[PDB]
Each structure stands twice: as C-alpha cells, then as structure tokens.
Design a protein around this nucleic acid. Structure first.
Lengths: 136, 174, 76, 115, 188, 50
RNA sequence: UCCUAAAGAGUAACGGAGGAGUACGAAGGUGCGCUCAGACCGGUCGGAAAUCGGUCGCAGAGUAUAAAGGCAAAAGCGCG
RNA sequence: GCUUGACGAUCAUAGAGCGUUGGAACCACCUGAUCCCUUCCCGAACUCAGAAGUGAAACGACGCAUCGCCGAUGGUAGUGUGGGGUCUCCCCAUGUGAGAGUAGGUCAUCGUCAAGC
C-alpha cells in the first residue's frame, strides 16, 4: 500500500495523539472533503480501501486528493514470545490523525454524488468523519 | 611587440570605436595554462618532467608542477600525483609572445578553414590552431619523442563580448 | 543489529549561573565545544571549559556579530 | 576589496588580542603613496595623538619611501612620550614585515620608543 | 452588510472561552490603520449568516459598536478545526487611500462551451480559487471572472491570462511566481 | 606504535619517554628537549630497552 | 556519542541508533605563508565529471577517526 | 563646521539588489625593477624607486524599497496549582502564555581622534 520509500530509522516510539488538527484542516485542493472529527489511526489498508471505494463510485471523472499519509512504523510481537527480547519487527504503517484533519478531497463532482462517495469511504474507516466544503 | 604597433596604435582609437568614456577599459591579456593532459599514463614520475623538458627550451620558463584536488577514481588513478603545468610569461616578454605564432609559425600543422565565424560564445572569439608540442623554434628533428599538447582559447578580461576582437589581433592575420 | 551500551553521561552544563559571585578559579561552564564564549575575565580551558580568572559576578551577555553567547565576569 | 579585505583578513588576531589584553596599539597605515603611524593605549579604544606623513616638517616630495619611513620612527614617539609607556606593540595590520613597515618600527627603538 | 458589535472589556484565555459556551458570543478585533486596535465582542449567530454570503470577505462590511461606525473589512478570520464554526472574526478598518489587500473569489463562467470539453473529451481542473489582491477600496471587487471558452485539452490558463476590474493589483504577478489557475486535463 | 626512551649522552639518564612508528623510520631520533638534572640539552638517543 | 530523559545535573529496560581497545616527531607548539564546496562550461585522445583559465558564489566544504556540540582571532594545507 | 580618514560602541529596523559621482587631501591602479625581497613558475601577488598618468573599472561615501529583517493587538496551542469527566483524551476555576500569521520601518543609530576647507 502506502509506505515511505525510505525512512531514516526503522522504528519509532509509541507516542501520543493529542491536540487538534489546526494544519491539514482546510480543503486545500478540492471542493468537497471528508474531514475527521475524532482522533485515531489509519493502518494504510484503511487508506487504500476507502480510496478504492471513492474512485469506484464516481465512475466518470473528477480529481481525488489523498491528504493523509501513513508515515510511522508500527511493530508487533509474534506469538509464543516472551515480553522483552528486543523490540519486535515492523508490520504496517499508520497516520496519526487529529480531529479536524482532512482525509480525502474531490473536485469535478456534483455535491450529491460527493456525499454519496464519501459515505462509501467513511464506512471503511474507523473514525468519526464529516463532510465539508471549500470555505474561501 | 610593445612598440609603434602597440603603444601608439592600439591605445588611443579603442576609446571611441566602442563609444567609451575614459581610458583604461582597454583589456589586457595575462594568462592561459598548458593543461597538457598528463592524467593519461600518469603513474610515471619521470616523463611528466619530459613536459618540463618540453616547456623549458621553447618558452624559456620553469614550470610549476601542479597537484590536483581529487582522488578521481573514474578519470584516472591519483597515484600519478601532479597533473598540472603552468607558467606566466611577462609583459616584457609579450614582445616575442605576440611574435612566436600567428607571425612566423601559424601553421602548426594545417587548417582547412580559419573562419572566425562559427563560435559566437560571447567571450571574445578567434579561430587559430596551436596544439602540437613540436611546432616551436629551437627544436631538432628527433632527440626526444616529446609529443604533448597545449590548449589555447581565450575568454573575456573585460565587461562584454565586443571588447576583445580588435584587441586580440595586432596584425591582419586570420 | 544489537543495541545496548550508552555512555556515562559527562555532567555538562552551566554551573554557577549568571548573577553569582565568583572566585578566581571557578569552573564556570562545562561545555562540549564553546556553546558559550569567553568574555572579560574568563579563561576558556582546553576542553572548552570556561573558568573565572578574576573575582566578581558573571554576566552572560549576547554581543557582537555571529550571535555569540558570551560569559563575562564583572568585578562588582 | 580584493586588497582592503584580504589585509583585514590578515589583520584579525592582533586586532582583538590587544583588546582582550589591554595593552598599547600602533594603528599605522602604509601604501604605495604613504607610511603613517598613530597610537592607541592600554585599553583597546583610547586615541593618544595623531602624527601623519601630512605633518609639517617633511612634506618635501619623496614622501612615503623607505628613506621616508625611518623619519617616522622618532616622529610619533615624541607624541607618545606624553603617554607614558616604554614598550609599544606592533600592528601588522596586513602590512607584511619587509619594507616601510619595519623601517618606521626599527627606527623607534633608537628613537626612545622600545618594543 | 452590517454587523452589530460591543465593547469587550475583559481579555484572556478563560474569559474568551466562556463567551463561546455561556454567552454564545465570539471575540473579535478591529485594528487596521495607524490607529488604536479595539477589542470587540460579537454574536456567532450573525457572523455565520454573513459568511453564508458568497461575497463576505471581498466586500466592505459596515460595523457599529455603539453609535460609532466604520468601513470594516474581514481580514483573516479564524475557525474551529473540528466543528468549523467561527471563533475570533478579526476585522480591519478602511483608510480610503491605501492599498488594502484582501482575497477575491473566482467564477469560471464558460465551462460548458469549451474546446477541451466539447469536442475533445476533457474535464476542468480548478487549481486555485480566491486569488489575493491589493486594491484601493472603491475598486474592491466582489468577483474576478475567469474565462475558459478557448482553453484546449492540455492548455493551462495562468494568472497572466487573467483580467478585470483594472485597478486591482494581483499580488502574485508582482513577483515572478505566476500561478496556474485552471486546467483542462484528460480523464482518468 | 612501540614505546621508546630518550637518554642523555653522559653517565646520566634523565629519560623523558614517548613512542613512535619504528615501522616507518628504522633509524633513530636526535631531537633534543629540556633536562632537569644536568641542565644542558643533549642528544636524546635510541631507547635500547634491553 | 545521540535518543529515551520530562528546556539545570542525574535517570532504567535482553529499549532504539551507531563507535572505540588508536593515530601524530607533524596531523604539536610557534614563527611565517595562506582560505571552501556548488551550479554555471571551453572538445583533436578525459567530454557526468580532471589539469585550470576566469564569470554568478551566498558553509551546503573541510576537521586522522563514531555521533553530538563546535568553529574565520580559523579549530584545513605549505614551509622554516 | 562638512568632505574624508583611523581603529572601535551596536550587530542581517544596520542586510543584499537596481542611478549619480570624488580628484585635493585621502584611496585603488599605474611606470618599472635597478638597489630590499616576493616566487610551490609571477612585481595583477606582494617588496618598492616613485608620482610620468588616471578617476570609469577598483573601492568609497552619496541615490532609489521589490526582497530579506524586525513586528503589534486580539485569538489560539501549550501549561503550574485545585477540582471534574463520557479519562489512550478533554473540560472548569485560577495564574501564566506562545509559534506561525495579521498595517508596515528602513539605502540605519552612536563615540572619540586628526589632517584640510
């Protein structure tokens, strides 16, 4: 799916996900957008699954922007493995998202079809999202 | 020469040929290196100074034997340590410098056209060839196989392109 | 492919902060390469340790070009 | 310039050493025209007095030579005997120690002005 | 366009945060000119009905605190990132003889009759709306028209190809950064 | 780098001590340093550790 | 040596990243001399690139060695 | 008194970029190396006999505000303490409080010293 092509380090910490998305919150490239209203994580096959629901529902045209990008490595321990024998290996990638972050954007589409497209997209996402328009 | 040809001819007219205001935006010619391509078969350390034995007798001056920057593992091997040769002749040797080729010895070997038309890279062009290391006064037929090279263009020593063309020439030789 | 082996944590930093009385031998900044520079009466040791060469109080000015953070001691 | 900064690229260490150290300074000037001198005392920023080669006694015409550099060695020295130091320190100031630079200098040693 | 406003003689984090949840107000300021900035409180119910209008930002909007009235401009409104309501409206004044930079929205009128839409199959690509201008206040436009009745499949209309009220300086043409305003592109 | 020794040319060994690459320069050193005892500087010869 | 480490020190883990078990008689002192790299280009053997000649340069270079922190009053080279 | 020198206070509100100039004093060249020497070969380096020449280049002050650079107010994020909640997070009281962004200054402000007008 969506990875960085390289990374400086193979592992990050766990970290936290605090604050609001004061950046990433405006519809910067399209006319309509799926903005998240709750915080969470998107495991890069939630990214692609909602992307495939969008492009398939429009069926004629329009340009679609993917504003989110999974950049941090997430590491699991396998089974039959005791705690603490070094940090486990990377499995997937995750974008840390805040309330207010624009996830997807679209143009060239009617306002009734964009709501029907981002409702297909939001059902494949573990977030509480919303539909927004371009403001100014 | 720095004489009747230089002092009383090249000086006073060049101000109003270009509609210039005052005196010393006349250019001057100072420097070009040998840059004899030492970097081939350079790990010798006995016949780089064959180009010292080449450069001494005909140009009258001791070379610097110039070490480069790199360990350039693609162009050559850096074990052949000094790959530059450079000399500055004098303004009091500009007499015989103007008078050693393009006065007596312009046929280095031959040119089938010396047209001063096919290079408008705006840095004061000319068209003449001097690259053989054999064409120079006071040389025998063969006591050294001293085959080397010598690379002559010129650039600007002034503001624009037009400043050099009547200045590079002194006589009516193409 | 194996991690461990951190070092033993050299205790660097600004000792004897910027209003304090000094005596004329005091180590004034332990330092890993002159993050602070030498003002009026301070010394600049070999490992870039700043040391008071006279008595007084330490000032911590910012001065000059290059944005040097200086440590100078004023005999006050 | 290519000339004025490359000597102030060389005039760098003693510039700022004698303000750290607070001792005497001899801010001279040489050129193809002239050879000057002017002295600053033991604090980095105090002018003593001035003495040019535009001084009243030797504007005779061969001004600023190595002949006319030894005339300057006892010249600002009398102007620094109202100052009160025996030794005096040497601004190289990007002026390479081969010509009028030392001939103002070494004529001060006989001229009551020690180094 | 008229806004009612009040005095707002108490400032801070927890004060401004309790106007929004108890009183239902928004904080604001007017500051512009060579004059004194003034803190202003204002109602969220009426500032959202002004932002309903298509020409909210590129239009002279009247405002009164009491009997005092000003030719006011909306300069850099602030917004809740999550729920999208207005907090801190942040107005300007108008001194009627300087250049008064603002944002002006775009129209893109002739999109049905386009040689890259009709004959050759292509769709439009809005890259930029709401260009930021600098214009004297009587020549403060609501709109800037963008004509796309001759753009072909592959042709790019820039801001160099743009237009009207002629007394309106575009800020991006003042520098070498010429911006691409729309496209017609082949479909996916 | 193997350890050397710098002796005086008398019946006195003050013996400042250091090391060098003898795998580069197989001869000795005749560079001369300060002496506390004899108080003249002297030809500081080979180690000769045996 | 950096991170974790919470803007003074310090601070754990079979936590995340790398290194050392030396070099140097000059690679030190000093005296003296002296300042990068980059794109831009000139093809008869190198033509992405050298020899370097000179034009816009805007530490991005270099530091014996890991990383951090530092530098021009150089904290790189030449030579006595 | 101003022109300009000569090291310094202050350090990109002082910085770069686009015209006019100064010749007398200063300043760069220039004429050349004889007598000092400078050369990894050289008097453009630099050492100088100099003052035959020259004010454009060279630099210098002196022009002009696009750009860098400073930058409110107000808000916001954070946060010490005390208390809540639906507690991987926020809210309330209270104290504090950015960063980024938002009209625009400006071809800076100083200090001693001197030859000349």
């Amino acid at each position: 799916m969506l990875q960085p092509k390289r990374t400086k380090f193979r592992k990050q910490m766990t970290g936290h996900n605090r604050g609001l998305a004061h950046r990433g919150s405006k519809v910067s490239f399209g006319e309509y957008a799926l903005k998240a209203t709750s915080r969470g994580r998107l495991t890069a096959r939630q990214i692609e699954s909602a992307r495939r629901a969008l492009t398939r529902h429009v069926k004629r045209g329009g340009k679609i922007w993917i504003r989110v990008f999974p950049d941090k490595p997430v590491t699991k321990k396998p089974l039959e493995v005791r705690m603490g024998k070094g940090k486990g290996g990377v499995e997937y990638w995750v974008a840390q998202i805040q309330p207010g972050k624009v996830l997807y954007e679209i143009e060239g589409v009617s306002e009734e079809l964009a709501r029907e497209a981002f409702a297909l997209a939001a059902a494949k996402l573990p977030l509480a999202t919303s539909f927004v328009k371009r403001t100014v | 020469r720095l004489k009747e040809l230089y002092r009383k001819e090249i000086a006073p007219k060049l101000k109003e040929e270009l509609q210039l205001a005052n005196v010393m935006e006349v250019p001057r010619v100072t420097k070009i290196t040998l840059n004899m391509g030492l970097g081939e078969a350079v790990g010798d350390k006995k016949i780089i100074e064959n180009a010292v034995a080449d450069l001494e007798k005909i140009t009258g001056q001791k070379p610097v034997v110039t070490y480069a920057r790199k360990s350039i593992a693609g162009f050559k091997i850096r074990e052949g340590w000094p790959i530059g040769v450079k000399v500055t002749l004098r303004s009091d040797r500009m007499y015989e410098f103007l008078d050693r080729l393009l006065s007596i010895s312009l046929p280095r070997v031959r040119d089938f056209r010396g047209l001063n038309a096919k290079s408008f890279d705006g840095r004061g062009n000319y068209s003449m060839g001097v690259k053989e290391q054999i064409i120079f006064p006071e040389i025998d037929y063969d006591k050294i196989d001293a085959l080397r090279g010598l690379d002559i263009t010129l650039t600007t020593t002034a503001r624009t392109d037009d400043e050099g063309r009547a200045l590079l020439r002194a006589f009516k030789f193409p | 492919t194996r991690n461990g082996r951190d070092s033993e944590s050299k205790r660097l930093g600004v000792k004897l902060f910027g209003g304090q009385a000094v005596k004329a031998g005091n180590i004034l900044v332990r330092l890993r390469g002159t993050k602070f520079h030498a003002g009026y009466g301070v010394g600049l040791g070999k490992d870039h340790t700043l040391f008071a060469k006279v008595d007084g109080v330490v000032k911590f000015e910012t001065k000059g070009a290059f944005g040097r953070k200086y440590v100078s001691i004023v005999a006050a | 310039s290519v000339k004025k900064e490359t000597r102030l690229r060389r005039a760098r260490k003693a510039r700022l050493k004698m303000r750290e150290l607070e001792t005497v300074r001899l801010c001279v000037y040489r050129s193809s025209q002239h050879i000057y001198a002017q002295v600053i005392a033991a604090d980095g920023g105090k002018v003593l007095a001035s003495a040019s080669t535009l001084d009243k006694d030797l504007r005779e015409g061969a001004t600023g030579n190595i002949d006319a550099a030894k005339k300057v060695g006892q010249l600002v020295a009398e102007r620094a005997k109202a100052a009160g130091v025996t030794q005096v320190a040497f601004d190289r100031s990007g002026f390479k120690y081969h010509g009028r630079v030392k001939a103002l200098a070494d004529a001060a040693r006989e001229g009551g002005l020690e180094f | 366009f008229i806004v009612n406003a009040q005095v707002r003689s108490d400032l801070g984090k927890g004060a401004s945060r309790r106007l929004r949840r108890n009183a239902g107000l928004v904080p604001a300021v007017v500051y512009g000119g060579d004059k004194e900035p003034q803190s202003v409180t204002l109602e969220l119910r009426e500032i959202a009905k002004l932002l309903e209008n298509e020409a909210a930002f590129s239009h002279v909007i009247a405002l009164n605190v009491g009997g005092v009235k000003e030719t006011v401009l909306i300069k850099a409104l602030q917004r809740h990132p999550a729920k999208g309501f207005v907090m801190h409206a942040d107005f300007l004044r108008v001194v009627a003889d300087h250049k008064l930079t603002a944002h002006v929205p775009l129209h893109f009128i002739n999109e049905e009759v386009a040689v890259g839409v009709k004959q050759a199959g292509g769709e439009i690509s809005h890259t930029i709306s709401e260009v930021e201008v600098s214009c004297l206040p009587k020549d403060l436009p609501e709109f800037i028209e963008v004509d796309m009745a001759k753009v072909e499949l592959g042709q790019i209309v820039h801001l160099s190809d743009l237009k009207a009220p002629k007394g309106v300086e575009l800020v991006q043409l003042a520098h070498g950064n010429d911006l691409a305003v729309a496209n017609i592109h082949a479909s996916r | 780098r193997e350890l050397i020794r710098l002796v005086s040319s008398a019946g006195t060994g003050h013996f400042y001590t250091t090391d060098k690459n003898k795998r580069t320069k197989p001869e000795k050193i005749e560079i001369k340093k300060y002496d506390p005892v004899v108080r003249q500087h002297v030809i500081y010869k080979e180690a000769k550790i045996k």
